[PDB]
């Protein structure tokens, strides 16, 4: 089973200068709950962004660098390797990977950040004609989590 996992804002910004443009603890917890015990797949730049692999799940990095050999990371070198990985695989980032996968994945777990940020990376446009809302749940706001946001689970129609 193959899912996208992503947070994008009202204009589908996902990234600025190789970071997330927002501080949102609730979203990162969301990620941890979903992906813990399973597999992440991510592109090189995204890994450099997180910098080490996430504990307690199988971290996998897509890169062309056949020199790449990082402790605690599986490495793959084509897209087509993804379909070999067993279990629940999450496509984790970033823009290049989403672009390449969005047409391929079963479903997407999207956090809509209900704001407009400055970005330099974007999620590809998509249509609800194509995507059934299996659930939609407002994140809770609070002293520490102050941007409105919604957890969407979308499943490919038809
Ligand atoms: N808000 C969110 O949900 C998330 C946002 N982001 C944001 O996304 C942005 C990063 O996206 P982007 O810059 O596109 O980088 P990516 O994280 O998608 O990594 C791009 C790299 O992945 C490798 N790669 C991708 N496709 C292939 C392929 N088909 N075959 C071999 N290697 C491949 C290449 O690495 P190499 O050069 O080593 O060959 C490529 O340069 C950042 O701004 C980050 O903050 C990232 C994750 C989540
Ligand atoms: C691009 O930056 C990140 C992307 C991501 C990826 C990511 C973040 N948020 C959402 N909703 N989907 C994603 N695929 C993460 C992330 C990032 O910054 C360190 O951090 C956290 C924990 C501390 C490591 C988790 C994920």
- The experimental method is X-ray
> At residue 134, what are phi and psi to the nearest 5 degrees?
-75, -25
Q: Which domain holds residue 111?
A: 1-158
CA pair distance 111, 22, nearest whole angstrom: 12
Beta-carbon contacts of residue 52 (< 8 Å; ≥ 6 apart): 72
3-state secondary structure of 81: helix
**Three-state SS for 54?**
coil
CA of 139 relative to ligand 1 center, distance in Å: 26
Query: Which ligand is in closest contact with the Cα of 121?
Result: 1
Q: Identify how many contiguous H helices and E strands the chain contains and give both numbers.
A: 3, 10
Separation of alpha carbons 145 and 5, rounded Å: 20
Q: Token digits for 83? A: 């379909």
Query: Cβ(49)–Cβ(19) under 8 Å?
Result: yes
User: Is 111 near ligand 2, meaning CB less than 6 Å away?
Assistant: yes
Does residue 66 line the site of ligand 1, with CB under 6 A?
no
How many structural domains is the chain composed of? Answer: 1
CATH code for position 141: 3.40.430.10
Q: Which two tokens stand for residue 155?
A: 């499943």
Q: Is any atom of ligand 2 closer than 6 Å to the C-beta of 62?
A: no
Q: Which helix (H) or strand (E) holds 89?
A: strand 89-93
Resolution in A: 2.2
Distance CA 6, CA 62 (A): 17
């Amino acid at each position: 089973t193959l899912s996208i996992l992503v947070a994008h804002d009202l204009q589908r910004v996902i990234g600025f200068e190789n970071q997330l443009p927002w501080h949102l603890p609730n979203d990162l917890k969301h990620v941890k709950k979903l992906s813990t015990g399973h597999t992440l797949v991510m592109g090189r730049k995204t890994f450099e962004s997180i910098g080490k692999p996430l504990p307690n799940r199988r971290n996998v990095v897509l890169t062309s660098d056949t020199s790449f050999n990082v402790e605690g990371v599986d490495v793959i070198h084509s897209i087509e390797d993804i379909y070999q990985l067993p279990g629940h695989v999450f496509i984790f980032g970033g823009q290049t990977l989403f672009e390449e996968m969005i047409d391929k994945v079963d479903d997407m777990y999207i956090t809509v950040i209900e704001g407009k940020f400055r970005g330099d990376t974007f999620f590809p446009p998509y249509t609800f004609e194509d995507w059934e809302v299996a659930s939609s749940v407002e994140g809770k706001l609070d002293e520490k989590n102050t941007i409105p946001h919604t957890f969407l689970h979308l499943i490919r129609k038809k």
